[PDB]
Amino acid sequence: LDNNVVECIKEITESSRNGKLVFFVGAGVSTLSDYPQWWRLVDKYHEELYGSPKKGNYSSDEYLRIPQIFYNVKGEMAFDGILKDFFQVDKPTNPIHDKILAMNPAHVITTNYDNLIDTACWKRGKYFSVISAEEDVANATSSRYLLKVAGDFRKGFKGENVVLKEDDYLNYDQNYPLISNLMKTIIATHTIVFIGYGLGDYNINMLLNWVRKLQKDSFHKPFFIRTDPSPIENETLIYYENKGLRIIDAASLIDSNEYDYLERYSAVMDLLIESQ
Amino acid sequence: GEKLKEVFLMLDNNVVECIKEITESSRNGKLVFFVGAGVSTLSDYPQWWRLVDKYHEELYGSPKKGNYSSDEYLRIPQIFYNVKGEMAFDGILKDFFQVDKPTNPIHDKILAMNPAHVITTNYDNLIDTACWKRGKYFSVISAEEDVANATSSRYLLKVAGDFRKGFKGENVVLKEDDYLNYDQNYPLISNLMKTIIATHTIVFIGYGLGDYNINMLLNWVRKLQKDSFHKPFFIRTDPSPIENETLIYYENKGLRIIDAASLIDSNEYDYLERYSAVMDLLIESQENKFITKDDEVIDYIYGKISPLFALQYIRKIDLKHVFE
Amino acid sequence: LDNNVVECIKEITESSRNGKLVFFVGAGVSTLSDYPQWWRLVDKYHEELYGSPKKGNYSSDEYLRIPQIFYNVKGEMAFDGILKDFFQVDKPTNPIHDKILAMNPAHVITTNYDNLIDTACWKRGKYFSVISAEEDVANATSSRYLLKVAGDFRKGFKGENVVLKEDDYLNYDQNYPLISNLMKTIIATHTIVFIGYGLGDYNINMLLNWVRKLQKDSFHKPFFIRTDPSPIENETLIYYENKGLRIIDAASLIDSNEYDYLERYSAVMDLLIESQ
């Protein structure tokens, strides 16, 4: 019924019983809680600086520079008020945030700047530690960790706390030294399962650049959950298998429509859950 | 024809202070052009999207159905190299880049702007043929070994490799492995590029303000301290005019932009009209045709003769060298 | 007893009772156990390198290049045999190893390549996970780590395993990627107390550089135990209270002559043990 992923599940359920499994939760999970996807905000910086909305599919150059262009031109207070008006919203808890916590993970690292996984923790009662700035690594009060590597809005709705702009991705190891370093230790020691990302995200490939610098057979290979609608090519699967990743695709396990994300995330995860 | 003189009177104070400083550096011998893919495509040279249409179809069976995402567009020649080998990667490069295409009139206008060096990200041979037609020799540098074995101290610095040592893919940086190992594989091409920018006047031709080369060069400029470096010039040849908020953002990053859609009115596909309206506006400002003020003829004769007040007498056979 | 040494102890005991105290075992605790110091080894090369022994003193260049020349000229089997001739020893444990385990450390990180802290933990029953090479970072069996950051001779008495040559010290971020990460992850989440270095040791200068990359007040400032004969001057003390090394100086607490090393080490540790 399945091809070569039957060995992939058995290590995960072994990692679930051992308590050595860490999910790398992404925005593909958080977009399921009808949270504002980031392209809506870029349009708000677009339509205030250009004086008109985007007429079509804009260029990838101005996909990382319109958050920065509004930062350098319109200032800091105007950039901060828009982060209030688009992020001070209440979204409910997705089933996936129960399904991710159904496996009882070792740590939860995420690039999500919301509080949605920070809501399903205390609702289910699993006590984690929210580290999102540099002042929380040394004042960490628990061996279990919730690591928000892109910052969050706990200290307020300002631009100083969260990684959005272009400068915050380049000047990143020179700004978050212990959150970059705490992440690479977690990936070294515990088994990483990606969920909620494509095979072309900024945060996914920057890991695979690091994995090649490591020694061969020194790392346990990361798993990837692909929930894209179109199925992966046979040459694309071998390109990330020969770069560290072990892809578990949803488009080859179940048959769904082109807009059926929540049905795709559950079918992989319940296959992981029901084995345990 | 005479449109350029009535363009010139419609320039604002920003572009006039760009043309006065680009042309003062060509006269000093401190002008360097940084040539991109824009002047190569005006000679019909095979663009890199015509290659990435070959790989995705010899690696995925069928031609493309939809637009390339930036995730896919960067990584298709690496999937072809890893899966389908290294002799077939060099075969596709051999199939498309055996052309012997002509040099566009823009290759003539760059060299007629009398440069000291020409840096290029183009792996073509088009700029190197045009330099040898004229009576100046450029030491072509495309590998690591060519820097210490340099000859003439006027470099044609091909920072993206070249196919002079064969049609092999290990001599030209094209893939993504070649984009992240560039500082490791090319330590001396990078240092020689960054020293010319630090010591000369730079004009960028053939780019569009979002490029991997312009962005990795404005990151190096962010590391330099304030007011120690001359700001590079950037010629923009795009159909849409530049918006004012973008020209603020790139002037604070250290680019002095001359928009070509802001100087002339042209069609969306007439790229030689936009390239020649900025290059001819520099070339005809040096070959002094935009002097119709009758007190700009005073500080032109003064700027060439006020040195000669330190001497007592000057021969008249020497004054025909003062005025070139 | 001044308040500064008092305020050093009142944290370290509270870190030991909370299980967040990590000792950094250094070259001091092995020479008290009379393990062969490295300078007689660089003598042994310099008896076959230049052909004649040390008529005078050495230079800091020859302190760092005499091993490398022998491995290049005499070969690879001649270098490993000299390490074989001097390291087939069974030296006993000092009491200073026992004063380190007496505070119940959360981790023990050392740059010593001997098995002396291995045997000191085996006798007292403190089971740890020795990580010396890079195939042990992912294959670790526990969460209490015994991290040899300089390698160990468990695989063999060969020059490949242990960083001794000049090429071995410059390619440390390229031969030990994870251990260079696993060390700094422990420094941020614990209280680090150094034992067994001078102020100008090469391993201490590298840790003082990484703290400069860190932020202001984002880290708990580690503690240094300096056991030199002459007491440190108060001017030198202020220079390390901002670079990131609180100093408990052993010479300013008791009286001892110019060669009683084990007296100076035993004094400062009993102030820690009797406080708990």
Residue numbers in the entry:
A (entry chain B), C (entry chain A): 22 to 297
B (entry chain C): 12 to 335
Give the original sentences from the paper that presented this experimental model.
As a sirtuin (SIR2) family protein, defense-associated sirtuin2 (DSR2) has been demonstrated to participate in bacterial anti-phage resistance via depleting nicotinamide adenine dinucleotide (NAD+) of infected cells, which can be activated by tail tube protein (TTP) and inhibited by DSR anti-defense 1 (DSAD1) of diverse phages. To defend phage invasion, Bacillus subtilis utilizes DSR2 proteins to sense and recognize phage SPR tail tube protein (TTP), then unleashes NADase activity of its SIR2 domain to deplete the cell of NAD+ and abort phage propagation during infection. Each DSR2 protomer contains three domains, an N-terminal SIR2 domain (SIR2, residues 1 to 297), a middle connector domain (MID, residues 297 to 627), and a C-terminal sensor domain (CTD, residues 627 to 1005). Structural analyses and biochemical studies reveal that DSR2 forms a tetramer with a SIR2 central core and two distinct conformations.
The cryo-EM structures of DSR2 from B. subtilis 29R were determined in its apo form at 2.92 Å and its complexed form with TTP and DSAD1 at 3.16 Å and 2.98 Å, respectively. The final models contain only partial tetramer including two complete protomers DSR2A and DSR2B, and two SIR2 domains of DSR2C-SIR2 and DSR2D-SIR2 due to its instability. In the structure, four N-terminal SIR2 domains form a central core consisting of two SIR2 dimers via a head-to-head arrangement with a buried interface area of ~1700 Å2. The complete protomer DSR2A and DSR2B form a scissors-like dimer with a total buried area of ~4000 Å2. Further conformational comparison indicates substantial difference between DSR2A/open and DSR2B/closed with a root mean square deviation (RMSD) of 2.800 Å. Besides the abovementioned identifiable α42, another obvious difference exists in the loop (α30-α31 loop, residues 633 to 643) of CTD with a ~9-Å displacement between two protomers when superimposed. In addition, the small triangular protruding module of SIR2 domain has a conformational change with a rotation of ~20° and a translation of ~7 Å. The result indicates that DSR2 lacks the capacity to catalyze NAD+ hydrolysis alone, suggesting a potential self-inhibitory property of apo DSR2. In addition, the active site suggests that residues N133 and H171 are crucial for DSR2 NADase activity. In vitro NADase assays further confirm both mutants of N133A and H171A aborting the NADase activity, which is consistent with the result of previously reported phage infection analyses.
